[PDB]
Structure 1
């Protein structure tokens, strides 16, 4: 039992990422019946089948089919994924809002299954630290960034300047800044290295999703998933406001620690949109979608970190009139266009 020699912040990141109990709390959060469907019985093909029902609902809504099939499909969904709503009525699956809500849950279920499968697979060695074994499963080089360097100064300033006044429920404190290097991702990203308009953007996610996020990278919703469950289609979503992405950590009062990503995203030509557009492909010659937000990080204060633009400017009006987005959103539809650079441990201080 050789005790791990990894730095203490990296060891804590490993423990927090592979926490089986956190995976169970996330499933209870969705009111999933863990007695009828324990974490060990959660299956990949089960999740894709549930995605198919969501897509079947989407098509039934789109042709008028009949709302009673939609009733049957909704009941079929709750049979496939056993829930426990105690005495209340389970939410019906008859409108686009409920399809998005269940697609989001399946997104988290998909990454939770990947994490658990990682843990219970491969090899195990009694003489090895579980932290050391779980670290190697991530297939990622993780190094703690020195607090006093210019990387951390830029990253801290990115956090400090782009917390929107709208997201007033909490404030953010940077605990740890990690430099991350997924195996093979640098080679995969090379075909996009010298594309224009490369920005450093945030991606917030639930803590449980990060075992899959680090082992497999950011992925696109599977083909079974309904394209109308996502505002701008089935792509990878980023933000330039740290608080916009931190909201997608789903941090609570009982679990105030969150994980957020800083990724280099090859945006190229930007299909600028102001409202929903459930697309699967992009128009020829366009490399990403930008949701136009009312507030944008002041473009006068942009800096370059390793030839990548960092929109750490404070929030100002964008001049866009008829848009449905409070803040900007960046979406790519090819996973090769993303190169993950930094991983942040954030403490959420909720104001009460």
Structure 2
């Protein structure tokens, strides 16, 4: 018999497809349900509502549960970047079968033997400011319509801003991350601050960037320590 709250029990069953509380401990992650009533929940629901891209029209999203997460050791790992400027709360989607690994080991960079296919700025950890760009990476379907998506605090610092694929060998001097510039951006005037982290939850507007290969922004870091995972959402995909 589990002593976890029912939403966390259900999350564990989804991730592991052993007793629930034994499986919980394997994640080496503290997981808390965010109260629907709360400021954090209001902000997160607004981020989901406002940043669904117009071209991702095969589905709408409904937030089922919001969890606050703290991986073992991440406070001390993130410490060197915790004071860097330009820390942003960004989306990362992945298949449900990857989440046991993501929570226990954190987000990782693809190893040498993995293909670079799909990584326009080379192997790194990729994030979006548009929920639906990340949600596409959950590979949900009508038949399997529930997915999981992360919100990470990402220590971007000075961004190396690019408009075309380039598998850079090294970041330029003084730069901490890559940003791919999209044609569409959340309205910067609507950014808010949550616990010292910028949240780009404005509705999508034209960025005014020309000569770019990207419809929407993306953000890449090349050091696993630049990521502090903060929330995990369970999303319902309603397909049209």
TM-score normalised according to structure 1 size: 0.66
After superposition, the CA RMSD in angstroms is 1.0
Q: 1:234·1:279 contact (CA, 8 Å) conserved in 2?
A: no
Q: 1:281·1:333 contact (CA, 8 Å) conserved in 2?
A: no
Corresponding residue SS for 2:126:
strand
Q: 1:228·1:278 contact (CA, 8 Å) conserved in 2?
A: no
Where do 5+ consecutive residues of structure 2 fail to align? none
State the Cα deviation string for residues 218-262 of structure 1 (Å, max 9, x = none). Answer: 000113335566211110000000010000000101000010000
The match for 2:108 is 219
In structure 1, how many angstroms separate the alpha carbons of the residues matched to 2:56 and 2:47? 16
Flag the 1:280–1:251 CA change in 2: closer, same or farther, 3 A: farther
State the Cα deviation string for residues 141-195 of structure 1 (Å, max 9, x = none). Answer: 0000000000000000000000011000000000000000000011100000010
TM-score normalised according to structure 2 size: 0.97
The match for 1:4 is 2
In structure 2, how many angstroms separate the alpha carbons of the residues matched to 1:280 and 1:168? 36
In structure 2, how many angstroms separate the alpha carbons of the residues matched to 1:257 and 1:228? 26
State the Cα deviation string for residues 290-334 of structure 1 (Å, max 9, x = none). Answer: 000000000000000001000000000001000010000000000
Q: 1:175·1:347 contact (CA, 8 Å) conserved in 2?
A: yes
In structure 2, how many angstroms separate the alpha carbons of the residues matched to 1:229 and 1:173? 27
In structure 2, how many angstroms separate the alpha carbons of the residues matched to 1:153 and 1:340? 19
Q: RCO higher in 1 or 2 (8 Å CA, sep ≥ 6)?
A: 2
State the Cα deviation string for residues 278-299 of structure 1 (Å, max 9, x = none). Answer: 1242122110000000000000
Number of aligned positions between the proteins: 238
The match for 1:231 is 120
The match for 2:59 is 170
Which is richer in strand? Answer: 2
In structure 2, how many angstroms separate the alpha carbons of the residues matched to 1:206 and 1:244? 14
Flag the 1:256–1:227 CA change in 2: closer, same or farther, 3 A: closer
The structure number with the bigger radius of gyration is: 1
In structure 2, how many angstroms separate the alpha carbons of the residues matched to 1:159 and 1:130? 33
In structure 2, how many angstroms separate the alpha carbons of the residues matched to 1:281 and 1:345? 36
Corresponding residue SS for 1:228:
coil
In structure 2, how many angstroms separate the alpha carbons of the residues matched to 1:281 and 1:198? 21
2:185 pairs with 292, 296, 300, which one? 296
Flag the 1:195–1:172 CA change in 2: closer, same or farther, 3 A: same
In structure 2, how many angstroms separate the alpha carbons of the residues matched to 1:165 and 1:227? 28
Corresponding residue SS for 1:177:
strand
